[PDB]
UniProtKB/Swiss-Prot annotation, chains A, B, C, D:
It comes from Homo sapiens. Palmitoylated by the ZDHHC9-GOLGA7 complex. A continuous cycle of de- and re-palmitoylation regulates rapid exchange between plasma membrane and Golgi. Pfam families: Ras. Changing residue 17 to N: Dominant negative. Prevents PLCE1 EGF-induced recruitment to plasma membrane. No effect on subcellular location of isoform 2. This is GTPase HRas. Alternates between an inactive form bound to GDP and an active form bound to GTP. Activated by a guanine nucleotide-exchange factor (GEF) and inactivated by a GTPase-activating protein (GAP). Its EC number is 3.6.5.2. SMART domains: RAB, RAS, RHO. Changing residue 13 to R: In SFM; somatic mutation; shows constitutive activation of the MAPK and PI3K-AKT signaling pathways. A motif (Effector region) lies at residues 32-40.
Length: 171, 171, 171, 171
């Protein structure tokens, strides 16, 4: 069985824990209850491969920067989240991505760009501009609704396929 | 994630467009304007790989300014299309074929032969005839109906499989 | 074609026979009952590979200290089963696994932990515990019910895969 | 796409041509027209691989036995067929198998045991001694019916799988 180290990264409030929790436990989290760091484990088959998803749920709040360094060392792939109703979240993602590359050096680093809360009728952020970005980045993009569970399994499973490719035809 | 430049080549009225928009907009068009150059991107997974399909819907028809020249050079794979109910559409294939080979300088070129309009009870091109040409070329031939969307995914994923395969070239 | 030698072990009455019969005879046969130890066979295709599964159904009854070493010795992978409503059979898993680690003389030996009787209401062993143990062993955890057939194939086929994967560290 | 060279062998009267023509044309052939040697080509997708199947249909007629050395020299894999209501032909696969080995000078040659005519109630060779012979040989065993089409695609696809596995044995 293969173990994959997924880190859920992103601006505070964007829906990280809720993403993570819909996966792990299949129920939506209303409570906005911050995070320092929380671990989750999940066994799934993806493309007929028995996978152990070891997901690290991180703190998005202005602080906890510094760990924002060693979980980046450790992570094998990042869910970069932001929220379709928040543009600054959209915007700081370039930050998160630059920090990552710097903590690993590597220019090629499994990441997936996730547009959360898409159940919200009120986007200040356009799929297209998200796409344009994932594009210049070289990475997939998926719009999700932790609330409605939609695209949740794809976000995570896609990130596994990214890592997996990255370890094998990543040369 | 792998991005792939695929070009939809052929003759006017074949169905290049219908084909295309069916793959992307997932719906059928007996209405699209007679083309020159129009682009499409599709994010998808094939063979557990996340793929970004960069599709150029080219044109044949009447006049067409300046296209052909260089789209080859950049095209990675070519979908060479013809209609089942048009014998002349079919002879033309050998000619698109031929320019690619010259622009590409090789016979490396990934292509998939497609016989569109699998739905007409008005065939004037025999499968057996198409199969041979394919066989001559040593490339796949898939019959399609943009109308009923029969075989359309196959055509596209087949060509991407070919590119994929081709990339192992002297490694 | 590959031959795969599977050995099912667990405490008496966990459902080892049933489980095997289900995969093989395709029905829940009840009182197959203890002490008769047979090997079954089944050709099947897993992930495009054709496999000959040679399954040994050990008689967990007047168990261990039969010629158990024989089989643990010629086994390539072990299906380690316990019943969901029997804590001791779960407790016993630790003993089977040490025996297997001794006889195979290796810490990494393909095996899958199985919680049989998914079906019974009267659960004594929560899934969390079994999953934490497997996690601790680096092995998959599947819940089955030989009775409703749920989970049965996944259980064995997750095993051939463990086997297949493990094979990869030879050379 | 990949090209695979399949040869169907077996005593006369067994179902070789009716197996090959069902695959290729999807029609049962009621008449018995003895074969010398026919070639067929069928393009298929196996396990996401675009395979061009070059199928050789050979003579069961002992008379044309001189042409075997040749087809055995070039074939990559052998569909070994016998009829479920004719022991002599079950007895004959043996001699076919030994010739292939000699010609090929190898113990591992892709083959598949095919017991055709699954549809006849006058079966005379039980699936168990076929299954047993197969395991001896170390190859798959498929029961087929050219008249009903049952098992025929299993039969050819399984041979493509053997070939591929077998080739893989070096990359
Ligand atoms: N409508 C909607 N609300 C969502 C969705 N995802 C999360 N939320 C809401 O957004 C708020 C933040 O969710 P949470 O998962 O805690 O975000 P977080 O990024 O983990 C925040 P932190 O950095 O502090 O850990 C919660 O009130 C939650 O219910 C979604 O897909 N749809
Ligand atoms: N029945 C049927 N009609 C089709 C199919 N594909 C295309 N057509 C018909 O072909 C006509 C032209 O299709 P279109 O895709 O625009 O042609 P083209 O090859 O794009 C044209 P151009 O080369 O000039 O850009 C339309 O009326 C459409 O209904 C198909 O699979 N089945
Ligand atoms: N409800 C339920 N009962 C089951 C299930 N599997 C087995 N059983 C029950 O367990 C009893 C014992 O099953 P068996 O398969 O013989 O277990 P065993 O491990 O072979 C026992 P032994 O090692 O002694 O031969 C069966 O008689 C049946 O009542 C299951 O998935 N669900
Ligand atoms: N009931 C039944 N009859 C079949 C089946 N396959 C073949 N037959 C019949 O058996 C006869 C021989 O079939 P054929 O395909 O010609 O056999 P062949 O072994 O290719 C003979 P040869 O060596 O001369 O080429 C035909 O009458 C055919 O219709 C089957 O699966 N079921
Ligand atoms: Mg959180
Ligand atoms: Mg067009
Ligand atoms: Mg038993
Ligand atoms: Mg014949």
């Amino acid at each position: 069985m293969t173990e994959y180290k997924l880190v859920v990264v992103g601006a505070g409030g964007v829906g990280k824990s809720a993403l993570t929790i819909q996966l792990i436990q299949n129920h939506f989290v209303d409570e906005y209850d911050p995070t320092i760091e929380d671990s989750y484990r999940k066994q799934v088959v993806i493309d007929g491969e028995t996978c152990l998803l070891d997901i690290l749920d991180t703190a998005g709040q202005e602080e906890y920067s510094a760990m924002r360094d060693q979980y980046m060392r450790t992570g094998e792939g990042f869910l970069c989240v932001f929220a379709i109703n928040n543009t600054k979240s959209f915007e700081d993602i370039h930050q998160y991505r630059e920090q990552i590359k710097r903590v690993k050096d590597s220019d090629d680093v499994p990441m997936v760009l996730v547009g959360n809360k898409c159940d919200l009728a009120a986007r200040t952020v356009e799929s297209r501009q998200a796409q344009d970005l994932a594009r210049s980045y070289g990475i997939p993009y998926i719009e999700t609704s932790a609330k409605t569970r939609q695209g949740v399994e794809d976000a995570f499973y896609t990130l596994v396929r990214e890592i997996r490719q990255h370890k094998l035809r990543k040369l």
